[PDB]
Enzyme design. Structure first.
Site, PDB file in Angstrom:
ATOM      1  N   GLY A  10       0.803  -1.211   0.000  1.00 18.84           N
ATOM      2  CA  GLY A  10       0.000   0.000   0.000  1.00 18.84           C
ATOM      3  C   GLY A  10       0.840   1.267   0.000  1.00 18.84           C
ATOM      4  O   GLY A  10       2.068   1.212   0.049  1.00 18.84           O
ATOM      5  N   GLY A 143      -5.480   2.027   5.520  1.00 20.15           N
ATOM      6  CA  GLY A 143      -5.727   1.799   4.105  1.00 20.15           C
ATOM      7  C   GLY A 143      -6.352   0.444   3.821  1.00 20.15           C
ATOM      8  O   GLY A 143      -6.201  -0.501   4.604  1.00 20.15           O
ATOM      9  N   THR A 145      -5.621  -1.518   1.264  1.00 19.75           N
ATOM     10  CA  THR A 145      -4.569  -2.425   0.843  1.00 19.75           C
ATOM     11  C   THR A 145      -3.675  -2.768   2.045  1.00 19.75           C
ATOM     12  O   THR A 145      -3.402  -3.935   2.322  1.00 19.75           O
ATOM     13  CB  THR A 145      -3.713  -1.815  -0.291  1.00 19.75           C
ATOM     14  N   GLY A 146      -3.238  -1.735   2.759  1.00 20.78           N
ATOM     15  CA  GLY A 146      -2.388  -1.895   3.923  1.00 20.78           C
ATOM     16  C   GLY A 146      -2.981  -2.800   4.983  1.00 20.78           C
ATOM     17  O   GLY A 146      -2.265  -3.587   5.602  1.00 20.78           O
ATOM     18  N   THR A 179      -6.986  10.040   6.231  1.00 24.80           N
ATOM     19  CA  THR A 179      -7.709  10.318   4.995  1.00 24.80           C
ATOM     20  C   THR A 179      -9.045   9.578   4.917  1.00 24.80           C
ATOM     21  O   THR A 179      -9.734   9.639   3.898  1.00 24.80           O
ATOM     22  CB  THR A 179      -6.863   9.941   3.758  1.00 24.80           C
ATOM     23  N   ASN A 228       8.004  10.280   6.901  1.00 27.39           N
ATOM     24  CA  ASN A 228       8.600   9.030   6.453  1.00 27.39           C
ATOM     25  C   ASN A 228      10.119   9.026   6.628  1.00 27.39           C
ATOM     26  O   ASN A 228      10.724   7.967   6.800  1.00 27.39           O
ATOM     27  CB  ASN A 228       8.221   8.751   4.997  1.00 27.39           C
ATOM     28  N   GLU A 254      15.561 -13.782  17.199  1.00 25.97           N
ATOM     29  CA  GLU A 254      16.093 -13.151  18.397  1.00 25.97           C
ATOM     30  C   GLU A 254      15.230 -11.951  18.811  1.00 25.97           C
ATOM     31  O   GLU A 254      15.223 -11.553  19.977  1.00 25.97           O
ATOM     32  CB  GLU A 254      17.545 -12.727  18.164  1.00 25.97           C
TER      33      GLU A 254
HETATM   34  N1  LIG Z   1       3.502   7.782   8.087  1.00 26.92           N
HETATM   35  C1  LIG Z   1       2.908   7.666   6.902  1.00 26.92           C
HETATM   36  N2  LIG Z   1       1.564   7.394   6.835  1.00 26.92           N
HETATM   37  C2  LIG Z   1       0.942   7.269   5.646  1.00 26.92           C
HETATM   38  C3  LIG Z   1       1.645   7.426   4.466  1.00 26.92           C
HETATM   39  N3  LIG Z   1       0.783   7.251   3.442  1.00 26.92           N
HETATM   40  C4  LIG Z   1      -0.445   6.990   3.950  1.00 26.92           C
HETATM   41  N4  LIG Z   1      -0.364   7.011   5.318  1.00 26.92           N
HETATM   42  C5  LIG Z   1      -1.447   6.739   6.280  1.00 26.92           C
HETATM   43  O1  LIG Z   1      -2.046   5.508   5.906  1.00 26.92           O
HETATM   44  C6  LIG Z   1      -3.445   5.555   6.092  1.00 26.92           C
HETATM   45  C7  LIG Z   1      -4.138   5.347   4.755  1.00 26.92           C
HETATM   46  O2  LIG Z   1      -3.722   4.135   4.184  1.00 26.92           O
HETATM   47  P1  LIG Z   1      -2.956   4.061   2.772  1.00 26.92           P
HETATM   48  O3  LIG Z   1      -1.576   3.458   2.950  1.00 26.92           O
HETATM   49  O4  LIG Z   1      -2.863   5.433   2.159  1.00 26.92           O
HETATM   50  O5  LIG Z   1      -3.955   3.147   1.897  1.00 26.92           O
HETATM   51  P2  LIG Z   1      -3.478   1.885   1.021  1.00 26.92           P
HETATM   52  O6  LIG Z   1      -2.703   0.906   1.866  1.00 26.92           O
HETATM   53  O7  LIG Z   1      -2.628   2.382  -0.118  1.00 26.92           O
HETATM   54  O8  LIG Z   1      -4.831   1.157   0.534  1.00 26.92           O
HETATM   55  P3  LIG Z   1      -5.866   1.784  -0.540  1.00 26.92           P
HETATM   56  O9  LIG Z   1      -7.194   2.069   0.116  1.00 26.92           O
HETATM   57  O10 LIG Z   1      -6.098   0.737  -1.607  1.00 26.92           O
HETATM   58  O11 LIG Z   1      -5.254   3.043  -1.123  1.00 26.92           O
HETATM   59  C8  LIG Z   1      -3.785   6.932   6.608  1.00 26.92           C
HETATM   60  O12 LIG Z   1      -3.970   6.811   7.995  1.00 26.92           O
HETATM   61  C9  LIG Z   1      -2.562   7.763   6.266  1.00 26.92           C
HETATM   62  O13 LIG Z   1      -2.345   8.796   7.197  1.00 26.92           O
HETATM   63  C10 LIG Z   1       3.000   7.706   4.516  1.00 26.92           C
HETATM   64  O14 LIG Z   1       3.640   7.845   3.474  1.00 26.92           O
HETATM   65  N5  LIG Z   1       3.629   7.824   5.742  1.00 26.92           N
END
Ligand SMILES: Nc1nc2c(ncn2[C@@H]2O[C@H](COP(=O)(O)OP(=O)(O)OP(=O)(O)O)[C@@H](O)[C@H]2O)c(=O)[nH]1
Ligand SMILES: CC(C)[C@@H](O)C(=O)N[C@H]1Cc2ccc3c(c2)[C@@]2(c4cc(F)ccc4N[C@@H]2O3)c2oc(nc2-c2nc(CO)co2)[C@H](C(C)(C)C)NC1=O
Ligand SMILES: Nc1ncnc2c1ncn2[C@@H]1O[C@H](COP(=O)(O)OP(=O)(O)CP(=O)(O)O)[C@@H](O)[C@H]1O
Ligand SMILES: Nc1nc2c(ncn2[C@@H]2O[C@H](COP(=O)(O)OP(=O)(O)O)[C@@H](O)[C@H]2O)c(=O)[nH]1
Ligand SMILES: [Ca+2]
Ligand SMILES: [Mg+2]
Lengths: 437, 417, 50, 298
Positions: A10, A143, A145-146, A179, A228, A254
Site C-alpha cells: 500500500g 488503508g 490495501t495496507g 484520509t 517518512n 532473536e
Molecule cells: N507515516 C505515513 N503514513 C501514511 C503514508 N501514506 C499513507 N499514510 C497513512 O495511511 C493511512 C491510509 O492508508 P494508505 O496506505 O494510504 O492506503 P493503502 O494501503 O494504499 O490502501 P488503498 O485504500 O487501496 O489506497 C492513513 O492513515 C494515512 O495517514 C506515509 O507515506 N507515511
C-alpha cells in the site's frame, strides 16, 4: 548470513520503504545505481549487508525488497526515483484500481486476484536465498490495501514459509493526517487476522511522528515526506542489528526472544532520541545519559502513552555512534532510582544493550541534524495497550450503528467478521490488563 | 485514469453543465478551441479525469449532452466553449418531453436512450480505468428528471460496479415553474435513492436567497444562479481534478461520506459567495450559505468534507475548523468519530485566490424531501394533472409507490436524530 | 554487565538490576466471499431486469 | 470559546466550578461523552486517561492526577511510606501502621509491635478483638477547651499542571474524650478561631505550632510521588484538589491521618475556594478577558 526480505504494501508501506531503502544505501555507502565501491568482493559475498542486498555479477547491490500496491501512482514514484536503478521490474507489483479504504476490498475482492502474483515475485527473491530468516512487512492500518491485503499475504506467507519469522512495521491511524473515517474498522480487522501470523510488530502512530516533527523539527504542516524520513531513521536503528556486525538481535527470531515473552503481546514500544532540527545545525551535543533519559519521556515515543502506568516485560536499548558501555551503565543506574520503572514479577528488571559505533546517517537536504550519538529503545510495556483501547472505542461508536458496514458486506465480507475481530481485541485488552497489574 | 464520464441531460442539466465545463476549462487552462494555454503544468497532471486527448494537443471534455428537444443544446453549441464538446456527443430528439417524467422515462426517452448509451459506451471504451459517471440535471422537469434517471438505471445495468454521481437540482414551492414539479421530483428521488452513490442536492430557492440577500441582487436570473452552481461544482470536484490524499476518487469519497447506502444526499456550500480565513470559514459553514433550502441546525451532520483552495497558512484553517466543530458542537453525530475532513488544493479558482467548499451529509435534508412529499400528496389525492402520466402508460400504483418510498426516506433520516 | 560481546563495529551486553489456517481453508473463505458477492450482484441484475 | 464536560455530577465543588465557568460566558459545557473538549471534570472511578490529549489542535486539561491513588488509598499510603526512601523509616509524622487482607501482606509483623500503652484502630484496646488497616491509636490527643473534645484538621491542597503545590489558607477543624450530638456552628472551627484559642490557652499561634508541620507533610507527600504522576511533558495536562486530614497530639505534634482525592468543602469556603480553583487551575491554561493560596515551594 541469513537473508531478510522486506515487503512493502500500500501507499504507506511503499513510501516508507523508499525512505528506508534510501537511508540503507547511504548507511552502507551504496550508490543509486546499485554500485558499492566499499565492497571488495564482486558478484557476492556473505557480508552483513547482504542480508538486505543481493549482488549481481555486474556489481549491482539489489535490495531484497518487493513493493506491492493496487494503484500505480505510488509505485511509479519508485520507478522514476533516484534509486530506481536498484530495483528491477519484477520487484514492483502494481494494480489498477485500489481498495478504496475498504479492508474487505483489499482482502477478498482485489486480494484474491493478485495474491498468487505477489507470491511468485516473492518466491523469486526467496529462490535466491541461501538461508532465509523471514520477512519484514511495512503497511498502514487504515488503508484498504495496507490492512486488507496485508492480512491475506501474512496468512499465505505462514503457509508457504511456515518456519520463517515475520516482523511488521505498522502505521497506526491518526485523524490529524487521516484520509478516511473507517480507519478504525480497517485497523481492528487487519490486527485480528494478522495476529497469529506476526512474530513481532512495531506500531508507529502518525500522531506521534507528526507531533515530533512539529516540536523537534519546527515544521508547521508536516508532509508524509517529513514523517517518512523520521520513520525511516527509527526503522533503520531497529534493523541495524540485522545489517551490521553485532551480537544483539542478529536474527529475526532473536527479536521475539528478547522482546516478546507472550506471543499475542508482541507490540514493543519504540522511543527515539535525539531528534534535532537541521536548520539550526549549531546545537548542543547531547550526552549518553541525556538521550537515555529521553527514552522515558513520552514525547519521544512512537506511540503516545504512559509507561509509568504499565509494566515492562522486556527492554532493549540500541545505541548508534560515540558510546561505550561505561556511560550506559552510569546512565541506567541514575535513571532507575529517578524514574518509575516497574517490570513484571516473572521477569528480571533488565536492559539489553547494543552499540553500533557508526553514528546515525542523515539524508542530505533533509530535516534532521546529524548527531554524534543516538539511541532507540525497544520496550515491551503494557502501556501501549492504551492505543488498542482508544482504537476499540472509536470502533464501538461506529459499529453500534453499523455505520459504513454495507461497504464491507457488499465486498463479500460477512458482518460476523466485525464482532469476531472486536472480540479478539477485547480479549487482547484483557491480556495486557492481566499482565499490567 | 481514473476517468469520469460526464452526462448532462435536459435544459437545466445542459445549462448548468455547460457552465461547469466553462469554469474548469478555465482552471485546467483549456481554451474554447481545446488547446492548452495554462501557465502551470500542474493543471495537466489530473487533466485526464475530465478530458480526452486528440491530435494537435487538443483536449476534449469527456461529456455527453442529452436532450429530447434541440433547443438548449443548440444554445450550448452557440455558447462559449461550445465547440470544445465533440460534435458527435450531442444526442437529442425532436419531440420534447413537455415537462413530463413519464415521457422522459418511458416513451420519448426510451426511443432516444439506446443511442445515448452508444455514445456512453464509446467514451468508456477509451478509458484505461473507468471510475464512474457524473450526471447533471434537474428533478422538476421531464428530460433531466425522467430520462436522466432512466439513463442512470441503464448505466448501472451495464456498469454495475462503477460509481454513479449526480448534481441534482430540486424544485421548491418558493420558485414557480411547471405545475407538475412535485410529481417529477418525487418519481425521480426514488430512482436516485436506489441507483446513485452520491447525489449533490441544490435548489433554486436557496440559490435565490444567496443571490438576493448575500449578493444583493434584486431580481436573479438563471445566469446568476448557474454562476454559483458552476463555482460549487468546481469546488466539490477539486479533490478529483488536482493532486491530493483526501477523497482522491469517487469510491473513496463515497466510502468516507456514506454511512448508510440510502443516505447519500449531500448539501454543498461555497465561500466566498461570488456575484480572511476565519471569515471564509464562517461563511461556508453558515446556514444562509447552503445551496439547498433546509436549515442544517434542524438536524445533524453525519459526515463533512471541506475543501480549501488557494494559498493559506492552513495552521489557522485547522484552528477555524475546530472552532466551528465546537461552536456548533451539537450538530455532529458522536458515533462517527472524526467525521469532518479537511482537504487543501493550491490552485485557486478564477479570480478568487482564496476559496472554500462545503460538502455535508446532513439529516436536515429530510425536510427537503418531506416538503416535496406533502406537495405530491396534495396533488395526487385530487389526481390533478395525472392524465399526462397515465396517458403515457403509467399506473396510479406506481405513484402511490413513489410516495411511500419518499416517506420511507424521510423516516430513515429521522432514525438518526 | 553480563554477556559482553565485542567487535570492530560495536559491542553488546546485558545489565540486570533486579530478578492456523491451511491453504484450502484460506481458499474456501476467499471463494465464499466471492460467491456472496456474485449472489448480491445477481440480485441487483434480476431487479434491473424486472 | 473553551469547552468542558462533567463526568461526576456527584461532585459538589466542580458543581460550582461548572457554574462559574458557564457564568463567565467563555465556557460552553458539552455533552458528557463528547470527545472534542478542552477541560474534563472527570468521573470519580476508572477515568479513561488513555483517551486524553489525542484530539488534534486541542489542549486538554483534566482535574485528576493519574497514579495519585497511591497517596489516596489506606493500604497504598502505608506501602508508599514504608517503601519510598523519601519517607521510609525516616518518617515520624505518620503513625506506626500495618496492612492485612481479610481471609502478600503485613499481619505477622504487626504482632511484634503490639507485644513489644497499646491502643490501636482499624477502636479497640487488646489485639485479638481487632482481627474481626491497623494503626496505633493516638492515646494522647489534643483536647479542646471547654468541652474536652477531639478534632481533626482539614486543609485543601491544589496541585496545578506545573505541579505548584497550593495550600488554601482556609482550613477547617472537624470537631468528651473517654480514655480507656452536635452544636461553633456545625462542629466546624475555622482557623481564625482555632488560632485565637491556641493563643489564649497555650500561648502559641496556629502558624508556629501546627501549620509548619502541615506544610512540611504536604510538600513531603506530594513531592515523593511527583516523578510518578507529573504531566510536565505529557500529551495532556492535569491538576487536582486534595483533602489532607491531620491530627494534633498533646505536645502539639501533627500526625497525618488521611489523604482524600475527592474532598468536599466547608459551605462558606466553597465559593472562595472554587473560584481560586478556576483562577489558579483552569484559567491558567485557558486565559480569559491577592491570593487565597499559600504555595509550598520546591
Ligand atoms: N507515516 C505515513 N503514513 C501514511 C503514508 N501514506 C499513507 N499514510 C497513512 O495511511 C493511512 C491510509 O492508508 P494508505 O496506505 O494510504 O492506503 P493503502 O494501503 O494504499 O490502501 P488503498 O485504500 O487501496 O489506497 C492513513 O492513515 C494515512 O495517514 C506515509 O507515506 N507515511
Ligand atoms: C420569489 C420569486 C423567485 C418567485 O415569485 C418566482 O417564482 N419567480 C420566478 C418567475 C418565473 C417563473 C417561471 C420562469 C421564469 C421566471 C424564467 C424565465 C424568464 C424569461 F423572461 C424567459 C424565460 C424564462 N424561463 C423561466 O421560467 C426564469 O425564472 C428565473 N430565471 C429565469 C430565466 N433566467 C434567464 C437568463 O439566464 C432566462 O430565464 C427565476 C429563478 C429560477 C429563481 C432564477 N425564477 C423567477 O424569477
Ligand atoms: N490513629 C488515630 N487516632 C485517633 N483518631 C483517629 C486515628 N485515625 C483516625 N482517627 C479518627 O478518624 C476520623 C476520620 O476518619 P477517616 O479519615 O478514616 O475517614 P474515613 O476512613 O471513614 C473516609 P474519609 O477518608 O472520606 O474521611 C477522625 O475524626 C479521627 O479522629
Ligand atoms: N439552477 C437552474 N435551474 C434550472 C435551469 N433551467 C431550468 N431549471 C430548473 O429545472 C426545473 C425545470 O426542469 P428543466 O430542466 O427545465 O426540464 P427538462 O428539460 O425536461 O429537464 C425547474 O425547477 C427550473 O427552475 C438553470 O439554468 N439553472
Ligand atoms: Ca560483496
Ligand atoms: Mg490508494
Amino acid at each position: 548470513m541469513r537473508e531478510c526480505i522486506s515487503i512493502h504494501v500500500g501507499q504507506a508501506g511503499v513510501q516508507i520503504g523508499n525512505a528506508c531503502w534510501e537511508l540503507y544505501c547511504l548507511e552502507h555507502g551504496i550508490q543509486p545505481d546499485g554500485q558499492m565501491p566499499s565492497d571488495k568482493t564482486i558478484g557476492g559475498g556473505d557480508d552483513s549487508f547482504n542480508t538486505f542486498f543481493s549482488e549481481t555479477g555486474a556489481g549491482k547491490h539489489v535490495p531484497r525488497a518487493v513493493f506491492v500496491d493496487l494503484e500505480p501512482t505510488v509505485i511509479d514514484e519508485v520507478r522514476t526515483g533516484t534509486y530506481r536503478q536498484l530495483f528491477h521490474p519484477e520487484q514492483l507489483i502494481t494494480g489498477k484500481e485500489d481498495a478504496a479504504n475498504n479492508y474487505a476490498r483489499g482482502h477478498y475482492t482485489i486480494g484474491k486476484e493478485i495474491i498468487d502474483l505477489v507470491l511468485d515475485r516473492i518466491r523469486k527473491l526467496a529462490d535466491q536465498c541461501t538461508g532465509l530468516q523471514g520477512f519484514l512487512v511495512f503497511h498502514s492500518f487504515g488503508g484498504g490495501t495496507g490492512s486488507g491485503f496485508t492480512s491475506l499475504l501474512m496468512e499465505r506467507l505462514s503457509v508457504d514459509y511456515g518456519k520463517k519469522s515475520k516482523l511488521e512495521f505498522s502505521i497506526y491511524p491518526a485523524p490529524q493526517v487521516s484520509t478516511a473515517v473507517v480507519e478504525p474498522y480497517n485497523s481492528i480487522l487487519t490486527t485480528h487476522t494478522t495476529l497469529e501470523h506476526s512474530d513481532c510488530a512495531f506500531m508507529v502512530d502518525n500522531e506521534a511522528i507528526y507531533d515530533i516533527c512539529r516540536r523537534n523539527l519546527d515544521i508547521e504542516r508536516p508532509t508524509y515526506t517529513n514523517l517518512n524520513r523520521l520513520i525511516s531513521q527509527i526503522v533503520s536503528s531497529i534493523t541495524a542489528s540485522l545489517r551490521f556486525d553485532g551480537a544483539l538481535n542478529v536474527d529475526l527470531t532473536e527479536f521475539q526472544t528478547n522482546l516478546v515473552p507472550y506471543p499475542r503481546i508482541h507490540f514493543p514500544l519504540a522511543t527515539y532520541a535525539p531528534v534535532i532540527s537541521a536548520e539550526k545545525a549549531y546545537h548542543e551535543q547531547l550526552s549518553v545519559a541525556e538521550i537515555t533519559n529521553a527514552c522515558f519521556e513520552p514525547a519521544n515515543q512512537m506511540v503516545k502513552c504512559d509507561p509509568r502506568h504499565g509494566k515492562y516485560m522486556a527492554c532493549c536499548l540500541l545505541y548508534r555512534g560515540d558510546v561505550v558501555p561505561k556511560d550506559v551503565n552510569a546512565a541506567i543506574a541514575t535513571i532507575k532510582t529517578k524514574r518509575s520503572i516497574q517490570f513484571v514479577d516473572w521477569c528480571p528488571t533488565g536492559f539489553k544493550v547494543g552499540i553500533n559505533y557508526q553514528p546515525p546517517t542523515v539524508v542530505p537536504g533533509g530535516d534532521l541534524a546529524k548527531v554524534q550519538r543516538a539511541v532507540c529503545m525497544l520496550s515491551n510495556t503494557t502501556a501501549i495497550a492504551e492505543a488498542w483501547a482508544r482504537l476499540d472505542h472509536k470502533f464501538d461508536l461506529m459499529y453500534a450503528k453499523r455505520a459504513f458496514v454495507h461497504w464491507y458486506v457488499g465486498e463479500g465480507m460477512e458482518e460476523g467478521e466485525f464482532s469476531e475481530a472486536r472480540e479478539d481485541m477485547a480479549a487482547l485488552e484483557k491480556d495486557y490488563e492481566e499482565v499490567g497489574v | 485514469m481514473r476517468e469520469i464520464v460526464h452526462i448532462q441531460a435536459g435544459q437545466c442539466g445542459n445549462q448548468i453543465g455547460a457552465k461547469f465545463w466553462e469554469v474548469i476549462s478555465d482552471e485546467h487552462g483549456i481554451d474554447p478551441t481545446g488547446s492548452y494555454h495554462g501557465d502551470s503544468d500542474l493543471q495537466l497532471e489530473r487533466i485526464n479525469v475530465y478530458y480526452n486527448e486528440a491530435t494537435g494537443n487538443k483536449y476534449v471534455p469527456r461529456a455527453i449532452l442529452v436532450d429530447l428537444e434541440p433547443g438548449t443544446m443548440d444554445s450550448v453549441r452557440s455558447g462559449p466553449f461550445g465547440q470544445i464538446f465533440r460534435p458527435d456527443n450531442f444526442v437529442f430528439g425532436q419531440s420534447g418531453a413537455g415537462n413530463n417524467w413519464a415521457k422522459g422515462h418511458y416513451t420519448e426517452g426510451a426511443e432516444l436512450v439506446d443511442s445515448v448509451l452508444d455514445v456512453v459506451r464509446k467514451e468508456s471504451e477509451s478509458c484505461d480505468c473507468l471510475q464512474g459517471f457524473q450526471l447533471t440535471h434537474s428533478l422538476g422537469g421531464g428530460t433531466g428528471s425522467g430520462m436522466g434517471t432512466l439513463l442512470i438505471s441503464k448505466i448501472r445495468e451495464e456498469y454495475p460496479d462503477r460509481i454513479m454521481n449526480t448534481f441534482s437540482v430540486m424544485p421548491s414551492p418558493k420558485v414557480s415553474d411547471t405545475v407538475v414539479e412535485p410529481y417529477n421530483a418525487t418519481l425521480s428521488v426514488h430512482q436516485l435513492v436506489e441507483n446513485t452513490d452520491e447525489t449533490y442536492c441544490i435548489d433554486n430557492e436557496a440559490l435565490y436567497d444567496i443571490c438576493f440577500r448575500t449578493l444583493k441582487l434584486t431580481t436573479p436570473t438563471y445566469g446568476d444562479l448557474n454562476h454559483l452552481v458552476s463555482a460549487t461544482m468546481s469546488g466539490v470536484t477539486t479533490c478529483l481534478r488536482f493532486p491530493g490524499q483526501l477523497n482522491a476518487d469517487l469510491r473513496k469519497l463515497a466510502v468516507n461520506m456514506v454511512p448508510f447506502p440510502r443516505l447519500h444526499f449531500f448539501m454543498p456550500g461555497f465561500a466566498p459567495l461570488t456575484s480572511t480565513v476565519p471569515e471564509l470559514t464562517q461563511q461556508m459553514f453558515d446556514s444562509k450559505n447552503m445551496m439547498a433550502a433546509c436549515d442544517p441546525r434542524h438536524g445533524r451532520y453525519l459526515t463533512v468534507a471541506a475543501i480549501f483552495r488557494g494559498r493559506m497558512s492552513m495552521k489557522e484553517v485547522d484552528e477555524q475548523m475546530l472552532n466551528v466543530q465546537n461552536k456548533n458542537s451539537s450538530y455532529f453525530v458522536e458515533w462517527i468519530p472524526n467525521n469532518v475532513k479537511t482537504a487543501v488544493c493550491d490552485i485557486p479558482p478564477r479570480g478568487l485566490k482564496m476559496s472554500a467548499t462545503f460538502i455535508g451529509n446532513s439529516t436536515a435534508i429530510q425536510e427537503l424531501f418531506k416538503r416535496i412529499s406533502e406537495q405530491f400528496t396534495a396533488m395526487f389525492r385530487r389526481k390533478a394533472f395525472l392524465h399526462w402520466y397515465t396517458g403515457e402508460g403509467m399506473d396510479e400504483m406506481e405513484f402511490t409507490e413513489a410516495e411511500s418510498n419518499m416517506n420511507d426516506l424521510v423516516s430513515e433520516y429521522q432514525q438518526y436524530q | 554487565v553480563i554477556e559482553l560481546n565485542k567487535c570492530t563495529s560495536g559491542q553488546s551486553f546485558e545489565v540486570i538490576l533486579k530478578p492456523d489456517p491451511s491453504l484450502e481453508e484460506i481458499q474456501k473463505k476467499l471463494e465464499a466471499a466471492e460467491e456472496r458477492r456474485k449472489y448480491q450482484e445477481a440480485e441487483l441484475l434480476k431487479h434491473l431486469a424486472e | 470559546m473553551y469547552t468542558f464536560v462533567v463526568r461526576d455530577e456527584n461532585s459538589s465543588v466542580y458543581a460550582e466550578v461548572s457554574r462559574l465557568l458557564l457564568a463567565t460566558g467563555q465556557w460552553k459545557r458539552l455533552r458528557k461523552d463528547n470527545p472534542r473538549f478542552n477541560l474534563m471534570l472527570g468521573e470519580r472511578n476508572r477515568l479513561p486517561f488513555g483517551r486524553l490529549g489525542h484530539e488534534p489542535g486541542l489542549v486538554q486539561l483534566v482535574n485528576y492526577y493519574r497514579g495519585a491513588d497511591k497517596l489516596c488509598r489506606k493500604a497504598s499510603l502505608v506501602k508508599l511510606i514504608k517503601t519510598s526512601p523519601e519517607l521510609s523509616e525516616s518518617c515520624t509524622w505518620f503513625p506506626e501502621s500495618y496492612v492485612i487482607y481479610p481471609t502478600t501482606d503485613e499481619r505477622e509483623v504487626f504482632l511484634a509491635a503490639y507485644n513489644r500503652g497499646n491502643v490501636w484502630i482499624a477502636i479497640s484496646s487488646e489485639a485479638s478483638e481487632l482481627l474481626d488497616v491497623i494503626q496505633k491509636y493516638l492515646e494522647k490527643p489534643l483536647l479542646l477547651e471547654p468541652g474536652h473534645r477531639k478534632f481533626d484538621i482539614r486543609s485543601w491542597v491544589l496541585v496545578d499542571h506545573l505541579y505548584n503545590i497550593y495550600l488554601y489558607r482556609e482550613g477547617v477543624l472537624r470537631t468528651p474524650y473517654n480514655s480507656a450530638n452536635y452544636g461553633e456552628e456545625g462542629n466546624e472551627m475555622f482557623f481564625e478561631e482555632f488560632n485565637q484559642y491556641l493563643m489564649d490557652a497555650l500561648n502559641t499561634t496556629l502558624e508556629n505550632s501546627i501549620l509548619l508541620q502541615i506544610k512540611h507533610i504536604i510538600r513531603s507527600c506530594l513531592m515523593c510521588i511527583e516523578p510518578a504522576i507529573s504531566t510536565k511533558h505529557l500529551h495532556y495536562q492535569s491538576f487536582q484538589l486534595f483533602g489532607f486530614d491531620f491530627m494534633v497530639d498533646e505536645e502539639l505534634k501533627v500526625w497525618l491521618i488521611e489523604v482524600n482525592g475527592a474532598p468536599a468543602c466547608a459551605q462558606k469556603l466553597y465559593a472562595e475556594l472554587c473560584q481560586g480553583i478556576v483562577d489558579v487551575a483552569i484559567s491558567s491554561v485557558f486565559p480569559l478577558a491577592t491570593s487565597i493560596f499559600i504555595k509550598l515551594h520546591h
